[PDB]
């Protein structure tokens with residue numbers, strides 16, 4: 001059964017989510033848009049295969065299809081825009097953290113540390129909920145990011161760790177509570193550099209995992225939801241690896257083509 005404390009914990013997480021997650025992206029506006037030798041690795045954007053769509057309020061539609069590489073010069077046509085969306089997302093994620101309580105009790109520096117450590121993951125997790133595995137696109141309000149699938153690579157070429165992550169996580173068909181919980185576990189990761197009260201955060205993370213584990217055992221009795229809790233935990237360990245992988249990828253690009261926003265600079269190196 002689920003205890004009173006567990007219940008209050010979920011509600012606090014759920015309350016924090018609806019207060020800070022603008023699922024319609026209504027306040028995402030005034031964002032940039034693509035214009036109208038060891039950089040070969042800097043070509044990490046090889047799987048940045050996303051067409052862009054914008055549903056005009058008046059009913060119109062703008063559709064953007066990206067260029068090609070082998071024209072190494074300027075394949076960052078989509079970076080600025082992308083960075084703005086990340087900032088909007090991050091802002092939302094920081095608001096999520098600061099609105100909990102177990103988080104605000106932690107000393108300031110510990111909040112900063114945990115945030116710089118989980119930003120990517122928390123934002124990555126939120127985007128999964130607006131991801132559509134059918135059309136391979138991320139519905140973000142009037143905005144849309146369609147994967148250049150059945151066009152660019154091939155629907156089996158999910159060799160890209162992150163895409164595999166989104167399809168795989170979407171496949172579990174998690175509930176909102178589960179998403180918020182695995183957003184808590186990620187946020188309160190005791191093993192993130194610079195963490196002071198690591199003993200506290202660690203125990204907090206255990207209470208979250210225990211709650212999620214409980215929730216699953218108390219609301220998903222069917223054979224297909226066996227080991228769900230572990231898959232999710234493994235799923236989150238994977239996410240950490242991508243995170244690190246990404247910070248690096250992102251920094252290489254920054255080292256030769258500045259584009260990161262002030263906020264992005266805060267969270268990461270710069």
Ligand SMILES: CCOP(=O)(OCC)C(=Cc1cc(C(C)(C)C)c(O)c(C(C)(C)C)c1)P(=O)(OCC)OCC
Pocket residue numbers: 047048049050079081082083085086087089090119120121123124127128131138145162250
């Ligand atoms: C068009 C990008 O599609 P996408 O799915 O990855 C494709 C390989 C994607 C990944 C992503 C996520 C982040 C956060 C989570 C840390 C904010 C980024 O900062 C960045 C870049 C590298 C652009 C700086 C990319 P998304 O956040 O796009 C943001 C504009 O969308 C996730 C659904």
